[model samples]
Target: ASIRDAGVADLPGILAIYNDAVGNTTAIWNETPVDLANRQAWFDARARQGYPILVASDAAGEVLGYASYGDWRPFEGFRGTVEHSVYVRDDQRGKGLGVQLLQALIERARAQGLHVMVAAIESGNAASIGLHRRLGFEISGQMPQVGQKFGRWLDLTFMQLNLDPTRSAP
Candidate 1:
């Protein structure tokens, strides 16, 4: 029903969404499914970095979707930018859940003083690109056949949004 910071209790639901993506969708590039422990470690890493892991849940507390961001690149110069990913449950796709989660994520990044948010999407994934475009992101770059999944080459599209356009320099 609402979006909020995720807790340890939300890990199971998060794990479910992640595994479902890996097993069934191009949303996740990985072919291997991970266990709960893997998700716990991921949560711990995010916590250690003081980043947010947000969940959109129903009134009954079931996780409808999740979103998070981390360093866009390992170099010190790229610290002001972050790359993010958002995932919705299998049963919940076109109900505006993704919009809600990503909007929240953008706000979180701005609050954290992030300069830019990058979304790397599969070029064929028009729905995702449309979402970013609606959120004010612009295409920055495109790579052809950069990845392989399900026996097919996948093109990668890079989109970015400046959190604070007026800020002169970092």
Candidate 2:
């Protein structure tokens, strides 16, 4: 598989993967599935902010997974921090597609001069947590029972990877 910038044609596959996660997993906190227009608007907003939306595709060009990042918070103090998400098609799990996508996303974040990349994962998502750990991210914080979904409370685990080690703040 290969990674590349996502275009308008990839929206349908992206929406399908996201909605499946929303409906079946606690990976996202949203309770409702979003429409194509919503995803389109999201793509537009990210593009406007000069952020990347990447997709992983197979030899035949079928999308297997995707990843991207945006500002961690909208405050000036947090300008150098970015929050990212990675998703693999439900049927494509266990093929290591998520790892491939996330690794590429991190490269993009660092290349953009981002100072930190954060992954806010559901506490019970062991696979996600393990993946981040393997990629050199450390658990920076945790909020217990901070969200609710599927008739139960969910905890949030914040993992962070520092992009640069020698930069001095000016």
Candidate 3:
């Protein structure tokens, strides 16, 4: 597998992974599948902000997973922080594609001069939590029942990675 910048052609695969997460897991809080137009707008917005959308593809060039990040908040005070997400196709889950995608995304974040990378995940997602932990992220905060999805309440776990330790702040 290899990692590369995501392009318009990768949207369908990215949408598939995202909608699956929306419908069957707490990985995302949304309950509805988004249309291509919505994803297109998202892609454009990220590009406008100079953020990266990365994809992991197989030798044959099929997308196996994707990852991306945007500003953690719109306020200027949050400029150095970004919140990211990673999604691997269900069939591709055990192959470490998520790890490959995330690693690439982290490199992009560092290259963009981001000070910190944050992941706001559902507390029950042990695999995601473990993945971030292995990547040098730490659990910085946990909010109980902060979101609802699939007819259940979901707790949010905030994990963060300090991109540059030499920086003066988090």
Candidate 4:
């Protein structure tokens, strides 16, 4: 699998994976599926912000999984921090594609001179938490009952990786 920054042509596949997560998985908190126009705005906004939207694609360019980051908080003090997400096709989990995609995104974040990258995952998703663990992320915080979906309250686990540990405060 090849992991690369996303393009306009990748939106449909991205949209499919996103909606599937919305409708079938707890990966996204939103229960309602989004449309192509929503995805277009997302793509445009990420591009404009100089952030990456990376996809793990096959030889035919099918997006198996995608990863991206945006401002972790809206304030200026949090400029160096980003909150990221990764999603794999429902049928394509456990294939190591997410690892590749996330590794690439981490590298991109460091290259972009970012300080910290965060993953806000559902507390019950052990697989995702473990994956982030394997990549050097540490459990930073947990917010219980802050979100709800699928008829249950969701706990958010925030895991973070300090991109350049050797560097002093930002």
Q: What ordering of candidates by TM-score runs from best to worst?
A: 1, 4, 2, 3
**Cα deviation of 154, candidate 2, in Å:** 0.5
lDDT string, candidate 2, 1-170, tens digits: 89999999899989998999999998888989999999999999999999999999878778788999998998999989999999999899998888889999999998899899999999989999999999999999999999999899889999999989799872
Worst 10 residues of 2 by lDDT: 57-66
Give lDDT tens digits, candidate 3, residues 1-170. Answer: 88998899989888888899889888888888998899999999999989999899878778888989998988999999999999888998888888888988899899888899999998989999999999999999999998998777889999999999998855
RMSD of 2: 0.9
Query: For model 1, how many clashes?
Result: 2
Model 3 segments more than 4 A misplaced: none
Candidate 4's residue-wise lDDT over 54-159, tens digit each? 9999899998989999998999999999999999998899898889989999999999999999899999999999999999999989999999998999999999
Task: Say which candidate scores most in lDDT.
Answer: 1
Candidate 1 lDDT trough over 10 residues, lowest sum: 20-29
The local distance difference test score of model 4 is 0.93
**Pairs that collide, model 1:** 1-57, 1-58
lDDT of 3: 0.90
Would you list the C-alpha lDDT of every candidate in the order shown?
A: 0.95, 0.92, 0.90, 0.93
What are the per-residue Cα lDDT tens digits for candidate 1 across 1-170? 69999999999999999999998888889999999999999999999998999999989999999999999899999999999999999799999999999999999999999999999999989999999999999999999999988999999999999999999978
